[PDB]
Amino acid sequence: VSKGEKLFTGVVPILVELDGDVNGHKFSVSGEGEGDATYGKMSLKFICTTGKLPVPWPTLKTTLMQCFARYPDHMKQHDFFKSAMPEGYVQERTIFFKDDGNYKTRAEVKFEGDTLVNRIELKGVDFKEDGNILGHKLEYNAISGNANITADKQKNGIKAYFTIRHDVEDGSVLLADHYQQNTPIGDGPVLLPDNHYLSTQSKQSKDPNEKRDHMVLLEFVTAAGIPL
């Protein structure tokens, strides 16, 4: 086992912080939970700390820790995310919502002592004030599916791409086209993978004792696409 992989063999505490601005509507989200990468598992609860969340929770799920993926033994040499730890990586995305605005996100994912911390800035522009996002017309349901990973040797990191299909309350679909770039924070060697994907199985719920705007997730993430 590498130094980075060794940090994830047990249960790891998670802290998430997000500062957001969508069409000048400012909001903050905090999250807490535990990661168990041996089983690809994350258990998370997110709270909007600024009152009412001005966008649907589903639009923030992908923004709110691919280091917790389970890489099968035969694919361990393709796990860039753990290889960058503990110093961490920067994760940047643009998410283009078809016929609506875009989110630009920049996050730093690293260990602070024993805690895996994900610190995120999100900026959203050009949204329709009574579209499906600012109008809150998305179904509060689980998003599952694949994130396609490729090496980015020029940046000593990875790129990813995938589309999320958000269900709209009228039975339409809002496509969220994700472009992702990750770069290591430290100067130590990282693993540059062959092409593969991460498969996410998600269960989304509410805490009946929580009065704050919130989202509870149970996520399972598995690397795939290179045969045993």
Using alpha carbons, select from 3, 189, 203 the residue that is nearest to residue 111: 3
DSSP 35: E
Which is it for the CA torsion 136, 140, 145, 147, positive or negative?
Answer: positive
How far is Cα 180 from Cα 221, in angstroms, rounded to an integer?
Answer: 17
Strand, coil or helix: 180: strand
Nearest by Cα to 69 from 40, 109, 111, 33: 40
* Domain count for the chain: 1
Which structural domain range is residue 200 located in? 3-224
Give the helix/strand (H/E) hosting 217: strand 214-224
Which candidate, 149, 147, 156, 151, places its Cα nearest to that of 185? 156
Query: What method did the depositors use to determine the structure?
Result: X-ray
Q: Any idea what the Cα angle at residue 153 is, between residues 147 and 155, rounded to 5°? A: 85
Q: What is the CATH number of the domain that holds 141?
A: 2.40.155.10
Instruction: Say what the resolution is, in angstroms.
Output: 1.6
